[PDB]
């Protein structure tokens, strides 16, 4: 299991654990993280609520983005150069102790 920190929109840092292979939405849902609206479509690429902003060194080694994710991601609020839809990103060793930001 690995530690993941979430900077929520209110500014509070949510520290929690997930298992390698778990999506970031899985992490939010299982641990009942208090992130308003997160995971609206329950990970079917029909919403932008699971948008997360990653550290650059983490972002650059994420799995190649699919066109389906990109179309949904295009509509997210507060898009950055390090943005992905969290329901598509699964935990890896390199993410231990990483921080993600909820825009």
């Amino acid at each position: 299991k690995i530690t993941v920190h979430f900077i929520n929109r209110d500014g509070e840092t949510l520290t929690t654990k997930g298992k390698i292979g778990d999506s970031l939405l899985d992490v939010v849902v299982q641990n009942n993280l208090d992130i308003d609206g997160f995971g609206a479509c329950e990970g079917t690429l029909a919403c932008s609520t699971c948008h997360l902003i990653f550290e650059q060194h983490i972002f650059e080694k994420l799995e190649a983005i699919t066109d389906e994710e990109n179309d949904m991601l295009d509509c997210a609020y507060g898009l950055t150069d390090r943005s992905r839809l969290g329901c598509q990103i699964s935990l890896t060793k390199a993410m231990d102790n990483m921080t993600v930001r909820v825009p």
């Binding site: 932008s48 179309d71 509509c75």
Partner: protein, 108 residues
Amino acid sequence: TEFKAGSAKKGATLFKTRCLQCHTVEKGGPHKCGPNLHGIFGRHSGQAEGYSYTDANIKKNVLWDENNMSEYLTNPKKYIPGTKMAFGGLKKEKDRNDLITYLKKATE
């Protein structure tokens, strides 16, 4: 037509549960994921200003009438292949009649 009026009230709650996540209907309502739909009826697809439509929607140049709208809502991607509107569809005609009834009214 091949479209008949339903319940605008029922149509309002359909909007809220199925469309509100992405769209507003009010005059002076903002774009969200999807574009504000005020005045959609009678306008062609891709013409709300300040919104970044897909190539697909614009070139499809649909004239939006209660009727076109029904076929669209059945299966958006089947109707405008390449649209980035991520909505599966409203398969029951009765649901569509209700919703369009509500849109006809709230978008004027």
